[PDB]
Each structure stands twice: as structure tokens, then as C-alpha cells.
Design a binder for these strands. Structure first.
Ligand code: ZN
Lengths: 80, 24, 206, 60, 155, 98, 118, 127
RNA sequence: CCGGGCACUCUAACGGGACUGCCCGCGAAAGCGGGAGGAAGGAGGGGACGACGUCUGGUCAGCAUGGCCCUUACGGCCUGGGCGACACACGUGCUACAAUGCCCACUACAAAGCGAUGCCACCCGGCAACGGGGAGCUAAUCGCAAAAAGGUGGGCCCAGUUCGGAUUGGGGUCUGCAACCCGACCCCAUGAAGCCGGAAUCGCUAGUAAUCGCGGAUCAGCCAUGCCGCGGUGAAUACG
């Protein structure tokens, strides 16, 4: 079960910081405290930095890792 | 039984409108 | 942990509302904040004379108001000196034809609300704690009155251990749902910590 | 009713879904009855006299 | 009952025969309060007790219950460091209730896959000397006349 | 035939402050649609009588909005100037719409 | 009557029966007697011969059931794994997955009360 | 010709128009035995009339609307009992000693606070 | 629905009515068993109401005020995260464990409430959430919305089952900038535990307990089965 409706959401303020990055090659990592944004295709290899709540961690995202949102990778708690 | 869902008595207790429960 | 407001268990009977009007959904929800400004304003200063009970009877746009005072003379001035200064500045935030009316408060010693501030005052003027209290009932019981009461509190006389003095006299049919009983609570800031007395006042009967 | 938190008087959030009612007199943040703008607290001791007409010790 | 000896819900007979027990009975059969199907069950219980037999279920529910209705039982009091089961009879109304109720109990602790049956069918083996109820009755009753060794506490 | 909405907080005042709104003008044209009651809609509410904790209590408060109307039947013009914009109603409310 | 791979509904109302197939609940239970038209109120222990077929024919060639399915899901969740999705966590931990607490009743997806002290 | 005798109970209103005749009775629309599925109940609702026996002497039309059937059947119970005193206001040689004329005030209890239902008090543990 | 019409419920405004006043009994009296009449009685039912004080009960975290204590900051703006972890233990509940039951269809009675950015009759796409188009209501006279238990018929036949719906895979609508952590709602699939609960233990004396369903509250939506109310149906039993 998923949900977004008619018109997918993605914070339109990290995109310019992306469709531009691979618009002339690539980069080495992006930094934006936004996980509310969907993961999209070209974001391949980009390697983003989504927040945790303190620390910051990598995301060598891929297509299979698309239908999923950026935040679907921010491990908050800490079990065991 | 209530909380069952997909059945009249599901959209009774919970009270909703889906398929199993239309508008006559 | 028991007993509630005296006028409260009355309102609908023997003691009308302050803002005694009527509104509706798209209204009221501010016809009260603004009606409480009839308080914060037409009472923030009269105190030194009345502050009795500013019940309003507005009726669409227009407003009847009424701001009672036991000292009808400190409300006016030179035939109407202070019945302006802010009497219009009463509208300097809410004009809406909101006026002003005052009446003859017959005996401040039959208006505990005052009697309280009275104590409060005498509680600030450091007056003898209980005495002015036993005087309270008197002054009051004297004014044709019936019952009384004065229930100060907290570290009386600036004392340490927080206590709460008594004092009142003949007839306090609080439970009686039909006595013209009055209330009126006074606070009184404090160089050692706030106090505040209640002061009740039974009156008439039916 | 903490002014550093009563600024909501902005009704100028950034995203409409952010106006936290607040009591008109008590301030707090919750229980803040919409019809009377204030709180559930006040309301009681309040209406108890007349700052709230139409009211009445709801018996029955 | 620190005061009144109670006014006892003094009900009424019934649309059928015209004798109290029914409504009472039914009430027992009744559940969650729907006297409806309740009533039904007691009426249709007469349906097979007039389909598998002819004898008007009038005296059945009668001559039957009068067998379930005990006439003894126990109630212990901790006099001296112990709870002694004292033997003693019963009152009308109770002896009755017990009787009446006992049915619907052992009336459902049955096999018959149908309600009205369980009911009806019970009433059958009721007036017989082999009734689910009459067992408990006998069972509980027989408890006494056995512990008769203590009826000196008589009461 | 006219129509007058006599709704409000009070009970027999909305009655009074519109009980004088009767014969005043039924003396030149015709009668009246009568002083009609109408089901009152009340608004209850309740809340923890205490400022912290304490189930059981919360205290009750109503607020009954009463209704009334009247309406003067066959009020042939001049049969209306009899009780024109003349009244007393204060914390009471009434409106017209025929 | 043998339908779906490793599947045999029997003696029970058909509309019912079928439910006995992995990819089938009382829902597709009718959408099956639809395009098949096969009388609904009957017994598998009574189906004709051109009837039983029309089902197997339809049911088998129309969906994705049994092993073939039970394995798509396993390989499907096995998916949430590999990557770094929150979901994999709840599976790689065998705990709730769609937004629940764990301080309490989380036993259905957790397993038998493994008590210690506290 | 015609009489009356309202009669209400529980919380159901019932107009009870009775006149001479046999036993052709009705209710809110359909006749009586029609809008009340021969429920063991109803039968008694009309028992009042059967005071000093009759039925086949008087008749009626009762639009008892309000509440629910149990109450309905009962509201009637009064009219067709208060109805035989508009005609025979002396029909109580065995009418009052029946009481099918005593509006029972058995009503419902309001949900008090704390509890769950005017009386139904919630579970508390360890004391 | 159109006239017409207040005698019918009804609506909210007032008044009336019940006081052991009437007779028998025992009585010193109060007054208790017990009848007449009365729609009702001996306080007819339920409420709002909680004494002098008790525990030093509760929160300075709603507010207020008598100090320890802050100030480049334990004061202030914001974003994300947290309050929703999980080996576990308890409290209070929801839903069950089914046949006096469950599922479908036809049809039908409640009362108190709620609706202008708001409640939504109808028509249409749609299995559907829901989006579009659209009558009137300023709300006894429109509508939320329909109630549900019940009733007539028929499907099921004692089966972990058409009982029961936890978990889970996928698709999708809605509110929102935004729902991964962390949202409800529809549909398909999956269909788990439970076959009535050890010791112990909670509520309730009548329209009460049990049960069914309706409403609002704060609120964008909402994790609400919880809270405050409404009636439908309507018991058991009290020796002491
Ligand atoms: Zn407040």
C-alpha cells in the first residue's frame, strides 16, 4: 500500500540541486536536510545526504530504490 | 464482526463507505 | 476539593449575567473578548470608586453598557470630565457606539466584592488581620445585611506556615438555592506572597 | 500563555496547517474551546458569573 | 437487604397458557435482553413437545420443573476455624428459580444443534428422572441427607 | 402574511420582547400567524472541573437558543405602521422575512 | 476437482471452495463464476466436466497463484532487504512494519512471550 | 359515533380513534397485526379493550408514531383503554384494577460522568 | 403535495398536581403494615448541590506570586528528528472465540444534537476511497443520515469453519508543502491467535445489568475501540 495521488511529491528545492548536478556530469555527494522528497531515476550514483537527527549518512541510491522516499533510509532509533 | 472490515458490520462499527457498503 | 461558586450555582436565577446580551456562531466568539475589554478598561481604573459589576446589554452595532460604581463621583468629574478621557478611548479600539452608564451603589458594605478588595486593601494597608474581618461582618451585618464571611489565607500576617483564617456571621445558606446571596473575591499582591479573601454576603430572601 | 509562543497571533505561519489555536486568556495550547476562544479552565470559573451568557448550570 | 424484605419482581402470567412461569422461564432463556427470540424459543420449544409427543406441554414444564425444584442444599459458616457445609431446605421462590433456571443451564449444556430443540428436548427428559437439570437438582440435593451429619447447626 | 424570527438565549423574554409585537397592528387589516413557540436548540459542553487530572466531574453547562415568530396575517400596509420600528428588545433578537 | 497448481477444492460450495486456492478469497470467488458463468450455488462434488475446466482454464490463465506467488512475495520482501529501506528492518528484525508500537502488544509479528524480568 | 382516549408510554405517542363495529383495527399505515409481526407482545396491547369483553363491538385507527415498537405497542395499550371511558366512563368494574390506564413513567437514565452509563461504573484494580 | 382546519401528538412558556388530606389497625406522639380515589405518592424517577475539617493530596508545566538560578545565553527563530523505540511486566479497552450466530437481499419505528468554507438530497465515471457537475437550506419545514438490535426469505450445518480478522504482499483515492521514521479510508490477496480464559478479581438492585446503533467535543486530516450524551430493546436477584 502506497500513496501520493495524482501528482507525485518531491521537495522542489533539492531537485535543482540534482537535475543540474548530472546535467553536466555528476558529483560526489549532496547535502540537504530533506527526506520528504521522492527518490527519482537519474539520482543514480548521485549519492545524497539525508539527515538522521544529528549525524548525516550516504545514499548511493538506485532505480530499485526509487518508488521509495528519501527518508525511507534514515535510521532514527538504535536497537540492540 | 466489527473491526472485520469488508462487510456491512465492518462499515457499521467502524462506519464507512467502500464496495461492500454502498448507498442502496 | 468541594463547594463551587455561589452566583454560579445561581446565574439562571437571583443574579443576572455581566454581558447580558445575545449573539450567534459567527459572533460571540469575540463579542466576549471585546466584552472583557469592557472590563480590562471600564474597570482597570474605576476600582478606586466602583468596579461594581459592568454588565452590558448591547443590541446590534449599538451597545448599552453600564459601568457601576459605589463612588459615582470619581467616574465623572467636571460634570463629565472623566466620562470622556477614555470613555471614548473606550472606542479607541472598539467604537461600535459603545457608551457608558453608572448607577447608585447603595452601600459598599453590602457588596463584598468591594468588601473583599476592602479587606484586600486593609490586607495591604497591613490592617489587623482578623479584626478588620470581624469588623467586616459587622460593617456589613450593620448595613441591613444578613450573612457574611471573609476567608483570607496563605501565610497570614506574612507569617511562614501557610494558613487560612475564617470569620463570618449569621446566615450563609450557600446550599440554599434561592437566597439573594452575593460573593466577590479579592486578591491582594504580597511582599511575602499573594493572599486573597472571598467574603460572602447573604441578603434578603425570596 | 507564553508570549514566546503566543506569536501565533500571526495567522501568518508559512503553511496554513500551523495555527495552534491558543486560549485567549489562559493561553496554554490545548483544550482551547473554539466557540469561546479561551480554555476549558476559565470557561468554568468564568461563565460561573457572566463573562459567558446564555450559559446555565446544565442540569437535567 | 439491610432493610426491606424486598418487594420481589412480581411479574405476570403470559399470553399463552396464562401462568407466570413462562415469562419467567423465557426470561431465563432470554439473553442480552431480546425477549423476542426468547419468547419464540419457549413457544417453539412446545413445537417439538407436541410433534414428538402429544401431551400438552402445559404440565410438562410443570410436572417437569417440580422435579428440578430442590428442597435442600448447603451454606457454610466459619464458626470454629473452618467452613462447615450445613444442610438445610429451601424457600418457595428460590427452590423455584433454581428449578426453573437449572433447565436453561443444562438445557444448553446439550448436543441438539438447534436452540428451540435444546429447550424443548430438555423439557422432555425433564419430567422423567433423567434430566440434565434434575441431575444437578438431585446432585445438589443429595449433597444434603448426606451431610445430615451437620444439620444440628440446623438454622 | 409576514414573518418574524424571535430567537435568543433567554426563555420568556424573547417571549416578552415580542409579546408586545401583536395587537399593535392587528387593528386595521387582519389577524396574526400567532405567537409561535418552536423547538429550542441547546448546546451542552463539559470539562475537567479541575486544572490537572481528575476524571469523574467536568461540570455541565447548557445554553438554550429559543425560538418564536408571530407574523401578522393580512397586514394591509397601514396594518403594519401600527408597530413599525418601535420596540424594547435588548439582549433579544428578531428578524423579518415573508 | 483439481484446479490451480497443487490445488483441490472439494465437496464444499464452489464459490466457497476456490478460497482454498492461494490467490483466491471470497472476492475472486465470484469474478470466477462470472466470465465462466458456471452456476454459482453448486458443489465441486457435482461440477460438470466442461465446467471444472472453464475454471482451471480461467483461474490458472488469468492470475498469479500458489508457489509461483508465495515465491514472488518472498522474493518481493527479500527485496526490501538488500537495499536500505526502513521496511527491511522490521523484517530483518521480525517486528511490526506498517507503523506500530513495540512497547506492548506486538506479539503477533513478534512471537511467544519471551519473559525475563524488568 | 366517535370517542378517543390518547394513551402514551415509555416514549411513544399514540392517537387512539375508536368507534363501533367489529375488529378491523389499524396503525401508522398498515393495520395493526401488519406493522407488528404478530409479536407475542402486541396481542396484549389490545388486551385493555377486552376488559368486560367486546372487541366485536368497537374498532379503531391508531397512528402511534414515536420511539420504537416495544413502546409503540404500549402507547396503544393506554388509548384502547382510555378509549372505553369516553363511551363507558363507568367501564372500571375491572379496568383500574387492571391499570391498563396507568401511564408508566419508566424512562431512561442519563449518562452521569465518571461511570460509563448513569450507573455502569468502570473497573478499578488493587485496593 | 393543494386548500381548508386545532379538537390530535407535538413544540417552549406558564400554571396547576401529592399534603399520610380519606377509612381500618396499633398508637402517647411522630408514624409504620394496609386499602379508596389519583396518570403519579409518602421523598414517583434522575439530576445540579458535596459541612467544621482530614491527608500537609496535585500541578509552581495554564495562569498568578513570596526565592534558589539564567543572560552571549537552560531567554529566542527555524529545519529535520523525538514524544509512536522494544527482552519484557501491569492497567484500561476494542474485537472475538460463533448457530439465541454469521453473510446477502427486501422493508421499517429513536432521541439528543451538528452544518459558509460548512453539512451535502440528485445525476454521472467508478468494484472503490474518491474527483467532477449540480436543488434547497441562512437551518421544527433543507440536510448530515441512514440508525442498529428487529422482521419476512433464502444461503451456511458444528468445520479453526463464509466463525474470527491480527499479520503480511500489491494497487489507489483523501487531507495536507509535506505523511520514510509517523496518517486514516477503499479494493484484491494473505488469511494469524482465540474453541469462553489459572490463583485472583470489576461493575450492577430497573428500565438498572446485558446489547444495538446515533450524535458532538478538539480537528486539515488523525492513529478515538477513549471522553461527554441519546434512545431502541429490557432481565436477574436480595434468606439475611
Ligand atoms: Zn483560560
Amino acid at each position: 500500500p502506497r500513496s501520493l495521488k495524482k501528482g507525485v511529491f518531491v521537495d522542489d528545492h533539492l531537485l535543482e540541486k540534482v537535475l543540474e548536478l548530472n546535467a553536466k556530469g555528476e558529483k560526489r555527494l549532496i547535502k540537504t536536510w530533506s527526506r520528504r522528497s521522492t527518490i527519482v531515476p537519474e539520482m543514480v550514483g548521485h549519492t545524497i545526504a539525508v539527515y538522521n537527527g544529528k549525524q548525516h549518512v550516504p545514499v548511493y541510491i538506485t532505480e530499485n530504490m526509487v518508488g521509495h522516499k528519501l527518508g525511507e533510509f534514515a535510521p532514527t532509533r538504535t536497537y540492540r | 464482526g466489527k473491526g472485520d472490515r469488508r462487510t456491512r458490520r465492518g462499515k457499521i462499527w467502524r462506519g464507512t463507505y467502500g464496495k461492500y457498503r454502498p448507498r442502496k | 476539593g468541594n463547594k463551587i461558586h455561589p452566583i454560579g450555582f445561581r446565574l439562571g436565577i437571583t443574579r443576572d449575567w455581566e454581558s447580558r446580551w445575545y449573539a450567534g456562531k459567527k459572533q460571540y466568539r469575540h463579542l466576549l473578548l471585546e466584552d472583557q475589554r469592557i472590563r480590562g478598561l471600564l474597570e482597570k481604573e474605576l476600582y478606586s470608586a466602583g468596579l461594581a459589576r459592568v454588565d452590558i446589554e448591547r443590541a446590534a452595532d449599538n451597545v448599552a453598557v453600564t459601568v457601576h460604581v459605589a463612588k459615582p463621583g470619581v467616574v465623572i468629574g467636571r460634570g463629565g470630565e472623566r466620562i470622556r478621557v477614555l470613555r471614548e478611548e473606550l472606542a479607541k479600539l472598539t467604537g461600535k457606539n459603545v457608551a457608558l452608564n453608572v448607577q447608585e451603589v447603595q452601600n459598599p458594605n453590602l457588596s463584598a466584592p468591594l468588601v473583599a478588595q476592602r479587606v484586600a486593601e486593609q490586607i495591604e494597608r497591613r490592617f489587623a488581620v482578623r479584626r478588620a474581618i470581624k469588623q467586616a461582618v459587622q460593617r456589613v451585618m450593620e448595613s441591613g445585611a444578613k450573612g457574611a464571611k471573609v476567608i483570607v489565607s496563605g501565610r497570614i500576617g506574612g507569617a511562614e506556615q501557610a494558613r487560612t483564617e475564617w470569620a463570618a456571621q449569621g446566615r450563609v445558606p450557600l446550599h440554599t438555592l434561592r437566597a439573594n446571596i452575593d460573593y466577590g473575591f479579592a486578591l491582594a499582591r504580597t511582599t511575602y506572597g499573594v493572599l486573597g479573601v472571598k467574603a460572602y454576603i447573604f441578603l434578603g430572601e425570596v | 500563555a507564553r508570549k514566546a509562543l503566543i506569536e501565533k497571533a500571526k495567522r501568518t505561519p508559512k503553511f496554513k496547517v500551523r495555527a495552534y489555536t491558543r486560549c485567549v486568556r489562559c493561553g496554554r495550547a490545548r483544550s482551547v474551546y473554539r466557540f469561546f476562544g479561551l480554555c476549558r479552565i476559565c470557561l468554568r470559573e468564568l461563565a460561573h458569573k457572566g463573562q459567558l451568557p446564555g450559559v446555565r448550570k446544565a442540569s437535567w | 437487604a439491610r432493610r426491606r424484605r424486598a418487594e420481589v419482581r412480581q411479574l405476570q402470567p403470559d399470553l399463552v397458557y396464562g401462568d407466570v412461569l413462562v415469562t419467567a422461564f423465557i426470561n431465563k432463556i432470554m439473553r442480552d435482553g431480546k425477549k423476542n427470540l426468547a419468547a419464540r424459543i419457549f413457544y417453539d420449544a412446545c413445537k417439538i413437545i407436541q410433534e414428538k409427543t402429544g401431551q400438552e406441554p402445559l404440565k410438562v414444564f410443570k410436572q417437569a420443573v417440580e422435579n428440578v425444584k430442590p428442597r435442600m442444599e448447603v451454606r457454610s459458616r466459619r464458626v470454629g476455624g473452618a467452613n462447615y457445609q450445613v444442610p438445610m431446605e429451601v424457600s418457595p421462590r428460590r427452590q423455584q428459580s433454581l428449578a426453573l433456571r437449572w433447565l436453561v443451564q443444562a438445557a444448553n449444556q446439550r448436543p441438539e444443534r438447534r436452540a428451540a430443540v435444546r429447550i424443548a428436548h430438555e423439557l422432555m427428559d425433564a419430567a422423567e428422572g433423567k434430566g440434565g437439570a434434575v441431575k444437578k437438582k438431585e446432585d445438589v440435593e443429595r449433597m444434603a441427607e448426606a451431610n445430615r451429619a451437620y444439620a444440628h447447626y440446623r438454622w | 402574511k409576514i414573518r418574524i424570527k424571535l430567537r435568543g438565549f433567554d426563555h420568556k423574554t424573547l417571549d416578552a420582547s415580542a409579546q408586545k409585537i401583536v395587537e399593535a397592528a392587528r387593528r386595521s387589516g387582519a389577524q396574526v400567524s400567532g405567537p409561535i413557540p418552536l423547538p429550542t436548540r441547546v448546546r451542552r459542553f463539559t470539562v475537567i472541573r479541575g486544572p490537572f487530572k481528575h476524571k469523574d466531574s467536568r461540570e455541565h453547562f447548557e445554553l438554550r437558543t429559543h425560538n418564536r415568530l408571530v407574523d401578522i396575517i393580512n397586514p394591509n400596509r397601514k396594518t403594519i405602521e401600527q408597530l413599525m420600528t418601535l420596540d424594547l428588545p435588548t439582549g433579544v433578537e428578531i428578524e423579518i422575512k415573508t | 476437482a483439481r484446479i490451480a497448481g497443487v490445488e483441490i477444492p472439494r465437496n464444499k460450495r464452489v464459490d466457497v471452495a476456490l478460497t482454498y486456492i492461494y490467490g483466491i478469497g471470497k472476492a475472486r470467488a465470484k469474478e470466477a463464476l462470472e466470465k465462466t458463468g458456471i452456476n454459482p450455488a453448486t458443489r465441486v462434488k457435482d461440477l460438470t466436466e466442461a465446467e471444472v475446466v472453464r475454471l482451471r482454464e480461467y483461474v490458472e490463465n488469468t492470475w498469479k497463484l500458489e508457489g509461483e506467488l508465495r515465491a514472488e512475495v518472498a522474493a518481493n520482501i527479500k527485496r526490501l532487504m538488500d537495499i536500505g529501506c526502513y521496511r527491511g528492518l522490521r523484517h530483518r528484525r521480525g517486528l511490526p512494519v506498517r507503523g506500530q508500537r513495540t512497547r506492548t502488544n506486538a506479539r503477533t509479528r513478534k512471537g511467544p512471550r519471551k519473559t525475563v524480568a524488568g | 359515533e366517535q370517542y378517543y382516549g390518547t394513551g402514551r408510554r415509555k416514549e411513544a405517542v399514540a392517537r387512539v380513534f375508536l368507534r363501533p363495529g367489529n375488529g378491523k383495527v389499524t396503525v401508522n399505515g398498515q393495520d395493526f397485526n401488519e406493522y407488528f409481526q404478530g409479536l407475542v407482545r402486541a396481542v396484549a396491547a389490545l388486551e385493555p379493550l377486552r376488559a368486560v369483553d367486546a372487541l366485536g363491538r368497537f374498532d379503531a385507527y391508531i397512528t402511534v408514531r414515536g420511539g420504537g415498537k416495544s413502546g409503540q405497542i404500549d402507547a396503544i395499550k393506554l388509548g384502547i383503554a382510555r378509549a372505553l371511558v369516553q363511551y363507558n366512563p363507568d367501564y372500571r368494574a375491572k379496568l383500574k384494577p387492571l391499570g391498563f390506564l396507568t401511564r408508566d413513567a419508566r424512562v431512561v437514565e442519563r449518562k452521569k460522568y465518571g461511570k460509563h452509563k448513569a450507573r455502569r461504573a468502570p473497573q478499578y484494580s488493587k485496593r
